[PDB]
Amino acid sequence: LHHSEKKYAEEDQVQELLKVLNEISKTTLTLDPRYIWRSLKDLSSLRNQELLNAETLCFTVNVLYPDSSSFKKNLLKFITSNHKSSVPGSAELRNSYPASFYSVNTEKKTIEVTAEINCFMHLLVQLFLWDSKELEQLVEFNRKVVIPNLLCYYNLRSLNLINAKLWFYIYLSHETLARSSEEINSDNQNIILRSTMMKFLKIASLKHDNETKAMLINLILRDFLNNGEVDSASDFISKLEYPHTDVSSSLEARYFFYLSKINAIQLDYSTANEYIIAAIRKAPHNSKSLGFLQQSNKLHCCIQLLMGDIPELSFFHQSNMQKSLLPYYHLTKAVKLGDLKKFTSTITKYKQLLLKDDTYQLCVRLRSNVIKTGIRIISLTYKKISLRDICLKLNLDSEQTVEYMVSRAIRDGVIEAKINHEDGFIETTELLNIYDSEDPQQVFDERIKFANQLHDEYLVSMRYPEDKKTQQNEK
Amino acid sequence: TTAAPLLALLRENQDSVKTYALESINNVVDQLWSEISNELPDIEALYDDDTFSDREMAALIASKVYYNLGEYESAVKYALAAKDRFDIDEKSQFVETIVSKSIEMYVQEASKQYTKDEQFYTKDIIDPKLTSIFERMIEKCLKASELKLALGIALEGYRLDIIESALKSKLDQDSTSENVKIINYLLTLAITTVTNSKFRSSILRKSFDFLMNMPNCDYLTLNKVVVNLNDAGLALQLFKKLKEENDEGLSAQIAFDLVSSASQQLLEILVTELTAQGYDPALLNILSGLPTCDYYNTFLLNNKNIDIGLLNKSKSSLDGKFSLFHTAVSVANGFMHAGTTDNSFIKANLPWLGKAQNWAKFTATASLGVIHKGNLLEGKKVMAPYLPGSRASSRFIKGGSLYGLGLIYAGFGRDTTDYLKNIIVENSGTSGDEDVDVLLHGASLGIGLAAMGSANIEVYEALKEVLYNDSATSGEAAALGMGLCMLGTGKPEAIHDMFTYSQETQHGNITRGLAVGLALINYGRQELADDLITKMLASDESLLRYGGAFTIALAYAGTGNNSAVKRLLHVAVSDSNDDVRRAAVIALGFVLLRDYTTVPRIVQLLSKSHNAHVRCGTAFALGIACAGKGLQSAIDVLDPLTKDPVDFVRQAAMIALSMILIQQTEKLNPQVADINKNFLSVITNKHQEGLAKFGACVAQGIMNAGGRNVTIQLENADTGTLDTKSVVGLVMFSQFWYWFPLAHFLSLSFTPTTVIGIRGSDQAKNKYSSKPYKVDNMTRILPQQSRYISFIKDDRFVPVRKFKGNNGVVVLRDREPKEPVALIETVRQMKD
Amino acid sequence: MSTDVAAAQAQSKIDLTKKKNEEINKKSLEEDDEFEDFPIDTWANGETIKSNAVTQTNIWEENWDDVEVDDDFTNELKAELDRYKRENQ
């Protein structure tokens, strides 16, 4: 009855572990273990949540533990203790195995392979805390317990890949506690959090684990951004090592999205634009991914107004993301029309929301782009145009001031005009017919090379999974 | 976090905060690595200035920074500059990363400087700090008390010193057998890891010193070294140890091993040295090998099982009046009946042999000498009704009996050389009749065999006179006979003459004969055969390109060097000369006898390309390479190649399968019985092409060869050494497609597999079971079977030295050497 | 609720047991679903999505309007006032 329910959950987990244990006894590998490990983690996340708070505890007790079973149980005491299903028949077993962590063998200590087992019991305690949706001291206790265990000995390739996924949860739970209710010791412990993450990346370099390296790089970028330590992250992004070989496509989505943030801050709007489109196309359409997409789209609108490119109105309408994106929709219309008065209203109306996402800093730089976009519209509309007419339209000062705006603005080439100060007009330089110039030559070359690069990626990838299947016995 | 407070300290102008800065940066160098790498040149300026005693500390920072960047090369330079403060991180549970890259870097430097001179331990190209961290790593292995780890890094680092210390200290004689065990493991790894001769020679010859200190040990291990280097001084010194013991049984045992493994030239001079040491004449007969032939003869006389209904069946299916058909059956039965002088083929087929004529009746006369191979005492007696002096009826018999007499006496025919030479000198002053050309033809192949590996410049001169006649078929044979005598000499005069006479003639037969004999002459010199390869490959002639491929093959035979195989692969695809494409692919097999595991994967490609000649050489590559233990894959790749439309591939594919599975059981792999019926099925059918019926029938005789008592031993497992006889036979055998008589040379690749026990006082799935069965002595035993046999704990015959576990003659000690015991009579004894 | 063309990523990616945890982690990292936080945060519900006909619910196609001010009242005033000048010319 009650023993049956905890026993069933345990038996699911055992088959998944046993599968990997067999695989790493032949020869440790990276990718074949992970696909199984990801499937197990889903089942554990769903069973911890839905089925009582003591179904983790049964497992933890059931296997041999250094001191983890007692640290697990502590967490459960606080939220109404459990004591049930820890008597023999939940502790008189070590759960079907052939002989490599089987009951008879382990107790006898003809072998002991707590190696794999310890890393999985860590995976449970992280999942279980985010399920509870709780933070306080329990976070601290999770931080303290697992980190030196993993640092008092080197890990095998399989075990390093379990412990990369624990680091993300440690980091996430620390950062949420600051956001629920800021504290003063959260600040000093953040230096500690900061130290371990970078030290980890060195540790993973020696084991030559591709998937372990990538996931830590994603963490360092995120950690700098919420601390706002962009200076240190600017040195980091020009000195990376990221592989895209074995990484999951969630990791790749995240990586590109982080770059777009730092770049936008450094006043690169052209590189930021390329990478934010990369991040979105990797990500799913699902409501699973919903919140990742909103922050991404907030940044994506912002980059375009920083360029002078001005997002589509369709883009808000085809998504059902309208209400989240409502403040960027009012900025889009404002910059396009040239109306500073419309713009100033938008940034006062929605100040609070923008400042939450910490995208308000990026938004104030847009008060400039109204003025510069306004001069580009006026140079399109009239080839030659008096200085005074600009002052009326955009609600600016003297003509001398307007002269200065254009002199600066054509250093980037935004207006693409030039001022005559003895003829008293502004004369734009565009009169297209660049197909009579040598320009398209340059362009076609680039598209051809872009095609060549997709061909190459096709070649290496097409045959590598083919090769696994043909080698593998299935006849 | 930020590194910014830390930069300010360096910049601050007081001495004191500059000393403290290096300490502070270094603590968290794994946290702020990307930050401090930009400003790593500030820290280099503090290294220059001599107002710091933390110069060593400043250098140490640089190492950790460059590892995290990605360049491991730069970190080790500056770790070595730091001097100390790098011996504390060799056992942490966090950072050993900088240290491990030092162990790698010394191995790279070690290879480069060893080749110039063995000493490189006093060069300034090697930092003194670098030597220390390497040394202490190998010491840590010894603290854990496994020497396999310690020896393994020493092999890479080209150290003579450390490998010398480990074996020196593993001698203490608390188990003599265990002391040898550790030397065996390294000897194997030396061969398979070090493909550089200089370093490998030094290690082998050094290993000898440890073996010879012990008073009791396995002396097979001493002999392994001697055979790889072929120094007659180490050979002599090894026998000298056994002469202080005055022990007959050992000396006889290792002499049996040595003749098969080492070269014929090694034996010819070695016995002379031993004669003047003073020995018993028994050992010196055994080193010539005449006793050794007799022991093998006896094994085959007693245990041979032949198929007389098969002899009838081939006879019915393939006609004696049909000359191609008659060649197949003559060859096929001869291999089956091989290894004992039996006359059953002659009497049964007494009218059938005479119906042929031309070179087919020449093939038939020499197949008698395949059956009667060996039997030295009786060699002349069974050949005498054919030999000139009572033969004048046919010129094919007169010459082809001399060829067949050459097979009987191959590698033992020093006296025979004189007799055959009279005949040749007579005929080399003439241009000959067509009577004389055929007669002289078979004299020339024959004397090649008798005088093989003798280094007779008398014979080289003798046959040089025939080449100069310009006789059509006699000159092709003369060229072949020269190559067989002067095997493994690398003489320059001989090389020069044959290569040039190719241009002198327009005859394709002759030109071809020189090209492939030049391969024999450059056997086993490897890159000192290089000058020839360049000349032959650059030649405009297709024939010299045909032979150039075979020159690579024999030169690097039994060594899988990357260079040799590269050249052969390229030649094959890029040429459009049918003969050449075939030859280059056959040559690969010789080079890759060392690693026969890889051959099926490499040549899977080549069988994929659907060109016939290319496919022909690929079947031959599988057959030669894998001629030992059977591979399921090797079989599968050949199997549709017995189905191809081109019939020349069909011939090769079945012959290759027969070389691969020579005497295995159909309970030892159940594909043996199936494949045997597949050959039979083609022959049964008469609706197929004659090319196909020829291919299956010749293959059938190879498959049943010895009466199923012998197997091909490319590389012996008695010492893990290449066999000269096996290589020579096979390359001659691949010429059968261009001259059928040469098939008979495959007999030299048959080496009899048996354990023959001998009294040492007058010389008379998952196979293993814990429940034994008894096996008689002098019955057929395979290389794979041998490892499961172990002399009984209470046994009346026990070997003097723990058993080698592979086929050959092993001397036993008899506890009662004078009480009666039933004996198996020796062929030697039966006669006299 | 889908970012760019709704069908273009609905066919591009679909669920797997393997991916499902990582996706949930992505939305948690930003900290919320960020479409149900926003009504509480402002303490209102939409009326400024009712700015234009196309904004509210996409049941039309795009016009490229963004204020939707009738342009008939201004074009009518130009027409009559111009005629009178010509009448008084």
- The percent of chain B in helix, strand and coil, each rounded to the nearest 5, is 65, 5, 35
Please return the burial class of B370, using the count of CB atoms within 10 Å of its CB with bins 0-12, 13-18 and 19+.
Answer: buried
Q: Where are the beta strands (DSSP E) in A341-460?
A: 384-385, 417-420, 425-428
Query: Is residue A223 a contact partner of residue A198, using CB atoms and an 8 Å limit?
Result: no
Decide: B and C in contact? Rule: 3+ Cβ pairs under 8 Å. no
Query: Is residue B672 a contact partner of residue B664, using CB atoms and an 8 Å limit?
Result: yes
Q: How far apart, in Å, do the first and last CA atoms of chain B sit?
A: 98
d(CA B725, CA B291): 18
The one-letter amino acid code at B657 reads L
Query: Is residue B525 a contact partner of residue B489, using CB atoms and an 8 Å limit?
Result: no
Please return the burial class of B627, using the count of CB atoms within 10 Å of its CB with bins 0-12, 13-18 and 19+.
Answer: buried
- Residues in B closer than 8 angstroms to A241, CB to CB, are 70
- Subunits with 3+ Cβ pairs within 8 Å of B are A
Whole-Å CA distances, B339 to A367, B217, B534 = 103, 35, 41
Query: Is residue A159 a contact partner of residue A116, using CB atoms and an 8 Å limit?
Result: yes
Place of tokens 């070090």: B194
Of the partner residues C1, C18, C23, the one whose CB lies closest to the CB of residue A319: C1
The one-letter amino acid code at B346 reads I
C-proximal residues of A, 222-261, CB under 8 Å? 222, 248, 250-251, 253-254
Query: Is residue A118 a contact partner of residue A147, using CB atoms and an 8 Å limit?
Result: no
Element (H, E) at B77: helix B72-82
The runs of H, that is alpha helices, within A66-209 are 68-77, 103-108, 114-132, 138-151, 157-180, 185-207
Place of tokens 């022991």: B295
Distance from CA of B36 to the nearest CA of A (A): 9
Whole-Å CA distances, B759 to B143, B195, B762, B809, C64 = 47, 40, 7, 11, 109
Residue B312 has, within 13 A of its CA and on its CB side, a CA count of 3
Best residue in A147, A191, A198 to probe B by mutation, most B CBs within 10 Å? A198
d(CA B808, CA B712): 14
d(CA B763, CA B431): 51
d(CA B651, CA B646): 9
Query: Is residue B485 a contact partner of residue B452, using CB atoms and an 8 Å limit?
Result: yes
Q: Which sign, positive or negative, has the C-alpha torsion B788, B794, B799, B801? A: positive
Is position C8 within any domain?
no
Q: How many other CB atoms are there within 10 angstroms of residue A399's CB atom?
A: 16
The one-letter amino acid code at B214 reads M
A203 touches chain B (CB under 8 A): yes
Q: How many other CB atoms are there within 10 angstroms of residue B702's CB atom?
A: 28
- Which of A203, A194, A269 is CA-nearest to residue A225? A194
Q: Is B710 helix (H, G, I), strand (E, B) or coil?
A: strand
Is position C57 within any domain?
yes
d(CA B547, CA B561): 20
Q: Inter-chain contact C1–A253, Cβ cutoff 8 Å? A: no
**Residue B761: which residues within 8 A CB-CB, separation 6 or more?**
B248, B814, B817
Whole-Å CA distances, C41 to A350, B406, B649 = 11, 106, 82
- Residues in C closer than 8 angstroms to A37, CB to CB, are none
Q: In chain B, whose CA is at the least distance from the CA of A230?
A: B2
d(CA B599, CA B565): 11
Is position C80 within any domain?
yes
- Which of B256, B409, B327, B190 is CA-nearest to residue B718? B256
Query: Is residue A82 a contact partner of residue A58, using CB atoms and an 8 Å limit?
Result: no
Q: Inter-chain contact C3–A297, Cβ cutoff 8 Å? A: yes
Query: Is residue B516 a contact partner of residue B731, using CB atoms and an 8 Å limit?
Result: yes
C-proximal residues of A, 179-208, CB under 8 Å? 179
Strand B750-752 versus strand B755-759 pairing type: unpaired
Best residue in A232, A237, A471 to probe B by mutation, most B CBs within 10 Å? A232
Considering all CA atoms of chain A, what is the largest pairwise distance in Å, rounded to the nearest integer? 100
Phi and psi of A215, rounded to 5°?
A: -70, -30
The one-letter amino acid code at B143 reads K
Whole-Å CA distances, A147 to A160, A187, B25, B89, B248 = 12, 20, 24, 20, 70
- Subunits with 3+ Cβ pairs within 8 Å of A are B, C
* DSSP-derived secondary structure letter, B748: G
The one-letter amino acid code at B556 reads Y
Residue B68 has, within 13 A of its CA and on its CB side, a CA count of 26
Phi and psi of B152, rounded to 5°?
A: -70, -40
The one-letter amino acid code at B302 reads N
d(CA A373, CA B561): 70
Q: Is B455 helix (H, G, I), strand (E, B) or coil?
A: coil
DSSP of A87-124: STTSSS-----SSSS-HHHHHHTS---HHHHHHHHHHH
Place of tokens 């599988």: B622
C82 touches chain A (CB under 8 A): no
Query: Is residue B187 a contact partner of residue B167, using CB atoms and an 8 Å limit?
Result: no
d(CA B459, CA B461): 5
Strand A417-420 versus strand A425-428 pairing type: antiparallel
Q: Inter-chain contact A284–C23, Cβ cutoff 8 Å? A: yes
Query: Is residue B448 a contact partner of residue B475, using CB atoms and an 8 Å limit?
Result: no
Q: Which sign, positive or negative, has the C-alpha torsion B513, B516, B518, B524? A: negative
- Which of B702, B676, B525 is CA-nearest to residue B620? B702
d(CA B289, CA B384): 24
Is position C66 within any domain?
yes
C-proximal residues of A, 69-98, CB under 8 Å? none
Q: Is A425 helix (H, G, I), strand (E, B) or coil?
A: strand
Please state the separation of Cα B227 from the chain's center in Å: 12
d(CA B369, CA B387): 12
Please return the burial class of A145, using the count of CB atoms within 10 Å of its CB with bins 0-12, 13-18 and 19+.
Answer: middle
Q: Which letter, b or e, does each residue of A254-275 get, where b requires 16 or more Cβ atoms within 10 Å of its Cβ? A: bbbbbbbbbbbbeebbeebbeb
Q: In chain A, whose CA is at the least distance from the CA of B27?
A: A195
Q: Where are the beta strands (DSSP E) in B136-217?
A: none
Q: How many other CB atoms are there within 10 angstroms of residue B123's CB atom?
A: 11
**Residue B416: which residues within 8 A CB-CB, separation 6 or more?**
B405, B406, B409, B450
Query: Is residue B156 a contact partner of residue B164, using CB atoms and an 8 Å limit?
Result: no
Domain count, chain C: 1
Query: Is residue B589 a contact partner of residue B674, using CB atoms and an 8 Å limit?
Result: no
The one-letter amino acid code at B85 reads R
* Torsion angle defined by CA atoms of residues B523, B529, B534 and B535, in that order, rounded to the nearest 10 degrees: -70
Q: What domain range includes position C66? A: 23-89
Method: cryo-EM
Q: Inter-chain contact C2–A285, Cβ cutoff 8 Å? A: yes
- Which of B543, B714, C56 is CA-nearest to residue A322? C56
Phi and psi of A367, rounded to 5°?
A: -60, -30
Strand B755-759 versus strand B808-814 pairing type: parallel
Is position C12 within any domain?
no
Is position C37 within any domain?
yes
Q: Inter-chain contact A202–B70, Cβ cutoff 8 Å? A: no
Place of tokens 């059509």: B472
SS (H, E, C) B506-539: CCHHHHHHHHHHHHHHCCCCCCCCHHHHHHHHHC
DSSP of A18-63: HHHHHHHHH---SHHHHHHHHHHHHHHHHHHHHS-TTHHHHHHHHS
Chains A & C: contacts with CB separation below 8 Å: 143
Q: At what angle do helices B248-261 and B232-245 cross, to 10 degrees?
A: 160
- The percent of chain A in helix, strand and coil, each rounded to the nearest 5, is 70, 0, 30
User: Rg (Cα) of chain A, in Å, rounded?
Assistant: 29
d(CA C89, CA C79): 16
Q: How many other CB atoms are there within 10 angstroms of residue B643's CB atom?
A: 9
Query: Is residue B710 a contact partner of residue B662, using CB atoms and an 8 Å limit?
Result: yes
Q: Quick one: residue B182, left, alpha or beta (phi over 0 = left, psi -120 to 50 = alpha)?
A: alpha
Query: Is residue B592 a contact partner of residue B565, using CB atoms and an 8 Å limit?
Result: yes
Strand B721-722 versus strand B715-716 pairing type: antiparallel
Cα–Cα–Cα angle for B16, B18, B23, rounded to 5 degrees: 100
Element (H, E) at B809: strand B808-814
User: Rg (Cα) of chain C, in Å, rounded?
Assistant: 24
Is position C87 within any domain?
yes
Element (H, E) at B797: strand B797-799
d(CA B190, CA B228): 12
Is position C34 within any domain?
yes
d(CA B427, CA A220): 91
**Residue A60: which residues within 8 A CB-CB, separation 6 or more?**
A68, A69, A72, A73, A121, A124
